[PDB]
Short mmCIF file of N, CA, C and O in Angstrom, two decimals:
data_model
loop_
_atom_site.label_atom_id
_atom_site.label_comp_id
_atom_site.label_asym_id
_atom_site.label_seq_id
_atom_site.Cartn_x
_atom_site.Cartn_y
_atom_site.Cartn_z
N UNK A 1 -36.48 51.09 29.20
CA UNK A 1 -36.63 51.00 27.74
C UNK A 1 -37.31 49.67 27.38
O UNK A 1 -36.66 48.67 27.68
N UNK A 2 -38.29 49.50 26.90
CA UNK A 2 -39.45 48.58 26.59
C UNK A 2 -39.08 48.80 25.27
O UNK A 2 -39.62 49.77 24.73
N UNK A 3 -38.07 47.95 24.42
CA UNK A 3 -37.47 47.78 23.47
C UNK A 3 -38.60 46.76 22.60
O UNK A 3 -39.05 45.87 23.31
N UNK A 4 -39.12 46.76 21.17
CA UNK A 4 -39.39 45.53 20.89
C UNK A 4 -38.39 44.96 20.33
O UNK A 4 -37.77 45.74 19.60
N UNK A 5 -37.94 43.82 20.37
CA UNK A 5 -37.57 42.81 19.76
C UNK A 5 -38.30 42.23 18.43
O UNK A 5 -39.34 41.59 18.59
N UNK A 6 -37.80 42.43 17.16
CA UNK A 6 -38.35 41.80 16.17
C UNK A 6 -37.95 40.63 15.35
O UNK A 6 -37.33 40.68 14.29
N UNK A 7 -38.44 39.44 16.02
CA UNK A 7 -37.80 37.77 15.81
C UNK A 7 -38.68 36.81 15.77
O UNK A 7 -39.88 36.90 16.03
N UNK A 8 -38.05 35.83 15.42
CA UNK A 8 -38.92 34.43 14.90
C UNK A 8 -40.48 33.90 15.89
O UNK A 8 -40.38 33.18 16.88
N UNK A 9 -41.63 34.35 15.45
CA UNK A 9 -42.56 33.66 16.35
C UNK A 9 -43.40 35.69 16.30
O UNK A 9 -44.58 35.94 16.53
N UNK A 10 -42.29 36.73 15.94
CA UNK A 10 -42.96 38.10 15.89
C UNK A 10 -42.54 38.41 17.14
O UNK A 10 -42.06 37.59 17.92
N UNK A 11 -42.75 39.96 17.43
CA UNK A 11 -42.33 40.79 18.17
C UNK A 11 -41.95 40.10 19.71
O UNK A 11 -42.54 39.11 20.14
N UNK A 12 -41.06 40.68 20.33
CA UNK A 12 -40.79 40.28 21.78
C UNK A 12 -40.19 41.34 22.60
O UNK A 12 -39.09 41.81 22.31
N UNK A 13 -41.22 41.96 24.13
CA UNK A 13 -41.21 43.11 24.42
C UNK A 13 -40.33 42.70 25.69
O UNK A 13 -40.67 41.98 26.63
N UNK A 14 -39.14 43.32 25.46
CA UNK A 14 -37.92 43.31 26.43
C UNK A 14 -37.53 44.79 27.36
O UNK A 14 -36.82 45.71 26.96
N UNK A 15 -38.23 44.68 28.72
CA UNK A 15 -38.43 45.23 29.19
C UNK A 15 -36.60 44.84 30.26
O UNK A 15 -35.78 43.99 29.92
N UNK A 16 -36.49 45.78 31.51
CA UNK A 16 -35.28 45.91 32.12
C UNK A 16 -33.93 46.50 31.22
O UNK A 16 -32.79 46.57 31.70
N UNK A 17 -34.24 46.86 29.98
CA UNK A 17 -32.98 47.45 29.58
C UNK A 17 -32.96 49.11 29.60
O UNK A 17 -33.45 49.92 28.81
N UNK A 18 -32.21 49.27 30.84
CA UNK A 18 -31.68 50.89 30.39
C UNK A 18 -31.10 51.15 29.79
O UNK A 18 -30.54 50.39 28.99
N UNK A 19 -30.90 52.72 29.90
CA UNK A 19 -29.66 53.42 28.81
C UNK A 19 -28.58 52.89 28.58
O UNK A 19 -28.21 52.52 27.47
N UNK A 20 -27.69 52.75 30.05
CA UNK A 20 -26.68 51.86 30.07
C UNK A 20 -26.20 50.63 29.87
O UNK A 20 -25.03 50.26 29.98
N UNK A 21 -27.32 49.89 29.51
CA UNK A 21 -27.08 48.47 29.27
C UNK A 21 -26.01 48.20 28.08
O UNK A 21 -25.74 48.88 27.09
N UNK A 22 -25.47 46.88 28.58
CA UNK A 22 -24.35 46.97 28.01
C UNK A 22 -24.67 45.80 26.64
O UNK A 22 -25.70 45.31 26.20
N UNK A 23 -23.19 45.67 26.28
CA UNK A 23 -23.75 44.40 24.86
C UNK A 23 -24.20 43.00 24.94
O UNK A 23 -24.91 42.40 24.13
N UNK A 24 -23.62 42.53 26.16
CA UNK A 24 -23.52 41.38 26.98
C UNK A 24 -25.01 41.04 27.69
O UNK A 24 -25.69 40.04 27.89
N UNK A 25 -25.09 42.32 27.94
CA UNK A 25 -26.57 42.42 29.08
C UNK A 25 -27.85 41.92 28.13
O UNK A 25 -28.64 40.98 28.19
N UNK A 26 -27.61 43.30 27.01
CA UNK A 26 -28.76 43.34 25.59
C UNK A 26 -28.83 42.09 25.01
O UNK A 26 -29.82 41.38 25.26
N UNK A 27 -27.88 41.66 24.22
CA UNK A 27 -27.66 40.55 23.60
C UNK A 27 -28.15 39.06 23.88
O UNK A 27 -28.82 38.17 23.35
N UNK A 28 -27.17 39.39 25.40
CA UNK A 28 -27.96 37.92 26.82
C UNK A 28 -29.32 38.02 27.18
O UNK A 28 -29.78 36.89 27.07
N UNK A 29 -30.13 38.74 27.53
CA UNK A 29 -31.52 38.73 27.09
C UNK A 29 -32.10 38.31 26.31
O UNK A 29 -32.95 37.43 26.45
N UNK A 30 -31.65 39.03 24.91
CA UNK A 30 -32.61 38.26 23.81
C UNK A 30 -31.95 37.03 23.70
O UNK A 30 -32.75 36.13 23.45
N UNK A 31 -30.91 36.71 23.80
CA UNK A 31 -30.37 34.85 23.99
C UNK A 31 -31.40 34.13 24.82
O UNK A 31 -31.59 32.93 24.64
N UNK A 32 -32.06 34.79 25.68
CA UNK A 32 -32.97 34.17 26.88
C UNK A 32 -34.17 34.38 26.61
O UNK A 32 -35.05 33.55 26.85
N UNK A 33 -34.35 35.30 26.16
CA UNK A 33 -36.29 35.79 25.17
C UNK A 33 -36.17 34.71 24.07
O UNK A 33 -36.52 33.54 24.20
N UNK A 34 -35.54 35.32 22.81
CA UNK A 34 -35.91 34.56 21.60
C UNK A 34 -35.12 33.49 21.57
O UNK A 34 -35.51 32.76 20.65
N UNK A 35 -34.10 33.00 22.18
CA UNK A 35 -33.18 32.26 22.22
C UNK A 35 -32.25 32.17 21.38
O UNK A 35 -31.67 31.09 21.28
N UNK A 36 -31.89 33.17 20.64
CA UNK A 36 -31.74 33.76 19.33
C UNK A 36 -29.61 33.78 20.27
O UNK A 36 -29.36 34.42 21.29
N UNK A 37 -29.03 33.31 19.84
CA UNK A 37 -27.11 33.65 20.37
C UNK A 37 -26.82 34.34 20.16
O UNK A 37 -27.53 34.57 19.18
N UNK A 38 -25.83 35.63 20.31
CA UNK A 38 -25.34 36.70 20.41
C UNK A 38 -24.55 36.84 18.90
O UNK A 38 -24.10 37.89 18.42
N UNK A 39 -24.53 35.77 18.41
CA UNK A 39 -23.94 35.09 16.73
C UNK A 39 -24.61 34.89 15.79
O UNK A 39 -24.16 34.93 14.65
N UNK A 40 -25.99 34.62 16.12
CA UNK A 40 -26.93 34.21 15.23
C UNK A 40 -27.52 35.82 14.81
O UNK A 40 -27.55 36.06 13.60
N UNK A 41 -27.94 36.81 15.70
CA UNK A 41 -28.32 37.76 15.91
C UNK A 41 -27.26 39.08 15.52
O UNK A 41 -26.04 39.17 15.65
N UNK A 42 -28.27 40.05 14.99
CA UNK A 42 -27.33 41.57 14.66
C UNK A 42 -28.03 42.37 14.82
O UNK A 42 -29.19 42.18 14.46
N UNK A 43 -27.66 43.71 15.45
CA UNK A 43 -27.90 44.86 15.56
C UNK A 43 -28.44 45.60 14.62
O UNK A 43 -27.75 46.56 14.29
N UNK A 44 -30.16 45.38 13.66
CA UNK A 44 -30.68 45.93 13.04
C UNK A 44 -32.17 46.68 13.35
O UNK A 44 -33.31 46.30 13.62
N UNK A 45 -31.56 47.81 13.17
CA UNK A 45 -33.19 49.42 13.57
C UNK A 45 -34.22 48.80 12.10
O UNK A 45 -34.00 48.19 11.04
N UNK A 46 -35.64 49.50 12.96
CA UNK A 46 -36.32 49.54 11.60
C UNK A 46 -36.08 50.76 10.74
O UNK A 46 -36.31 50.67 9.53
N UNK A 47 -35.83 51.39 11.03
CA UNK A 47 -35.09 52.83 10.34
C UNK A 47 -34.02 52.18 9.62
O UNK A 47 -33.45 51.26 10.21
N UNK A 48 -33.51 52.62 8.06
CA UNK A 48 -32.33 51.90 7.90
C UNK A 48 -31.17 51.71 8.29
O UNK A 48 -30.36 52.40 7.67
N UNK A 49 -30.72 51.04 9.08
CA UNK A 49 -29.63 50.29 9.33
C UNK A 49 -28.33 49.94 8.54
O UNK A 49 -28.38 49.20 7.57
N UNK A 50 -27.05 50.54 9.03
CA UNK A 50 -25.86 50.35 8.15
C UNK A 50 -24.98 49.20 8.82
O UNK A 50 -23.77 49.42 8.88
N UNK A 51 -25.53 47.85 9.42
CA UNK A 51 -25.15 46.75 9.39
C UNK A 51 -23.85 46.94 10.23
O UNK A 51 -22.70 46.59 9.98
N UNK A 52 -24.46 47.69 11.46
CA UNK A 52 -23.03 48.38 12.61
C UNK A 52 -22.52 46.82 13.23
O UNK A 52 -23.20 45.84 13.57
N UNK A 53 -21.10 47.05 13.22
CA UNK A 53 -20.48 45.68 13.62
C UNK A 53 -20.41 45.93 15.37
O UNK A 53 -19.80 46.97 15.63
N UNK A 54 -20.86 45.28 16.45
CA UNK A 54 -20.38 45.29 17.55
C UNK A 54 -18.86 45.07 18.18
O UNK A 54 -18.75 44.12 18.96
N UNK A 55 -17.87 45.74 17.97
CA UNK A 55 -16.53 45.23 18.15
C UNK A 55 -16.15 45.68 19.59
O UNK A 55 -15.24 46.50 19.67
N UNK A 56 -16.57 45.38 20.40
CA UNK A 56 -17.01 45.46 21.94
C UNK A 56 -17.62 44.50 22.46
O UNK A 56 -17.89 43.57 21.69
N UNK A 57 -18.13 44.35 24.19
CA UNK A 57 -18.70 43.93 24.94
C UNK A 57 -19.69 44.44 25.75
O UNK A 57 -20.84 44.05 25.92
N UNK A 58 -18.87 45.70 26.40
CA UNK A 58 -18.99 46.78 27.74
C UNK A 58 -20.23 47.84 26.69
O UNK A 58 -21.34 48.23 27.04
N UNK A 59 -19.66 48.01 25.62
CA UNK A 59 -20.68 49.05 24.77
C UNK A 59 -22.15 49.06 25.34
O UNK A 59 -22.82 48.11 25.74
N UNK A 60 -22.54 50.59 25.25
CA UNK A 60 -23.98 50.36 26.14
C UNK A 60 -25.00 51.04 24.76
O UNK A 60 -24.60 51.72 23.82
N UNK A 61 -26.37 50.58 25.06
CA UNK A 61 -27.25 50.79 24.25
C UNK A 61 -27.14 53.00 24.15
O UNK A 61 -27.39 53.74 23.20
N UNK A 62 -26.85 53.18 25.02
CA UNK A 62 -26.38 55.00 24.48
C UNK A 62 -25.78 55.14 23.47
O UNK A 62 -26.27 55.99 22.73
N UNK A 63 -24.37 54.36 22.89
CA UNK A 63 -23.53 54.13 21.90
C UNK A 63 -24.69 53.87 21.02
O UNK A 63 -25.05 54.77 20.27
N UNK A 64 -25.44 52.47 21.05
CA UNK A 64 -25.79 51.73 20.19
C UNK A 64 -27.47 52.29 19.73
O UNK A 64 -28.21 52.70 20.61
N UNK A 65 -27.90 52.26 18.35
CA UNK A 65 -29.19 52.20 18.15
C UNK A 65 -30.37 52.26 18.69
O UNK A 65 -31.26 53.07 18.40
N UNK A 66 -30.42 51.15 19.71
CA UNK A 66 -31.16 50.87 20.13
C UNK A 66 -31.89 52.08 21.30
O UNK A 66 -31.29 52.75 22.15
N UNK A 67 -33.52 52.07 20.94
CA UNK A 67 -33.67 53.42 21.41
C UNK A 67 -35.21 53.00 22.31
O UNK A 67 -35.69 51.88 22.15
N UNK A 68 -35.67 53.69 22.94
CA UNK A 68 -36.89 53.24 24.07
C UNK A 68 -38.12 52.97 22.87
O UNK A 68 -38.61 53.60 21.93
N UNK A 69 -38.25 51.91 23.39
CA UNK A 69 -39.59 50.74 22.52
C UNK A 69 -38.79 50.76 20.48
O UNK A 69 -39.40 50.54 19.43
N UNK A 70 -37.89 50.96 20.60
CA UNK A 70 -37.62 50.79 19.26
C UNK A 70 -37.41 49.44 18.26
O UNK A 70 -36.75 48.59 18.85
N UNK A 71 -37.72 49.11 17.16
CA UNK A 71 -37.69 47.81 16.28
C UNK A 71 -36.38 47.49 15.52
O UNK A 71 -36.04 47.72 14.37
N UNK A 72 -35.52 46.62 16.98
CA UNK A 72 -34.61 45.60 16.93
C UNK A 72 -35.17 44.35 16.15
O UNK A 72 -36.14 43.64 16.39
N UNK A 73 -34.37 44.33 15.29
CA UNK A 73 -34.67 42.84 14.21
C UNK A 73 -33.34 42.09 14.43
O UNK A 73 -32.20 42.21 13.99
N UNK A 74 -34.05 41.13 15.44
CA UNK A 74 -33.18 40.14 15.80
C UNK A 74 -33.00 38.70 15.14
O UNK A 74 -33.64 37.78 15.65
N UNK A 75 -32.40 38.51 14.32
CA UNK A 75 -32.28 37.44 12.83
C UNK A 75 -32.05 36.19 13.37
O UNK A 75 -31.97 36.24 14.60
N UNK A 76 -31.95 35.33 13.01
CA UNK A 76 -31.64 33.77 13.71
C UNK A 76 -30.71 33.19 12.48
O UNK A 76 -31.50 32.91 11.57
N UNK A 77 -29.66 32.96 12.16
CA UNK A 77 -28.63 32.75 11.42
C UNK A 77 -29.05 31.03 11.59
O UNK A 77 -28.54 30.34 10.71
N UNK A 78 -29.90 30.29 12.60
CA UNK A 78 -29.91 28.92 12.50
C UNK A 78 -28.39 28.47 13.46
O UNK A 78 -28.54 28.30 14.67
N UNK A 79 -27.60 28.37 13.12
CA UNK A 79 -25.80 28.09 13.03
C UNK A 79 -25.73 28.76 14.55
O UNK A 79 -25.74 29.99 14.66
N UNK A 80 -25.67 28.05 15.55
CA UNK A 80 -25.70 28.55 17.44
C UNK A 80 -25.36 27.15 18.35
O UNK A 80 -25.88 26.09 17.99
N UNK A 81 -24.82 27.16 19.07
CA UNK A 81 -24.29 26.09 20.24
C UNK A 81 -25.95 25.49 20.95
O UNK A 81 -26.52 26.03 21.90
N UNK A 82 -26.34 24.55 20.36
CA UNK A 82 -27.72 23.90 20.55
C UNK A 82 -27.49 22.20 21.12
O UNK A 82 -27.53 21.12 20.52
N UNK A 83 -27.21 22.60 22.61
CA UNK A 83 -26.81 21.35 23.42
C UNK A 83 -28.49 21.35 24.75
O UNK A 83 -28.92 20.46 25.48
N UNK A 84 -28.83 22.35 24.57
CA UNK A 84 -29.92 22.37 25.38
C UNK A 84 -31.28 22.64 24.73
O UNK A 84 -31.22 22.86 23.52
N UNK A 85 -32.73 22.69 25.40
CA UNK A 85 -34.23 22.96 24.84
C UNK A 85 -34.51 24.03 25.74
O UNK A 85 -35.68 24.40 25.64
N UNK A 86 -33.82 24.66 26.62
CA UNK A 86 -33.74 25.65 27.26
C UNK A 86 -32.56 25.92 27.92
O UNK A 86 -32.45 26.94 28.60
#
């Protein structure tokens, strides 16, 4: 699933996520792409979106929205644990 990512700087094509990927997996990626924290960031489709709360970990993108090359809008809240530049 060649997901885009839609975040600060514009699109970011996050490739290695299968079906099964979990919230931890998804999330930790784009923490490592956009650098965007698993806090700063929410689970929004370009299709409208009802602002689904993740109340899990293990949850895999099958559960979740997220669909092959689909437009994840990954938000930057600013407010994230910023002790490093990478």
């Amino acid at each position: 699933w060649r997901v885009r990512c839609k975040a600060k700087g514009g699109t970011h094509l996050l490739q290695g996520l299968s079906s099964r990927t979990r919230l931890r997996e998804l999330q930790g990626q784009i923490a490592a792409i956009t650098g965007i924290a698993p806090g700063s960031q929410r689970i929004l489709v370009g299709y409208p979106p009802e602002c689904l709360d993740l109340s899990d970990r293990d949850i895999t993108l099958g559960d979740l929205p997220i669909q092959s090359g689909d437009m994840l809008i990954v938000e930057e809240d600013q407010t994230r644990p910023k002790a490093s530049p990478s």
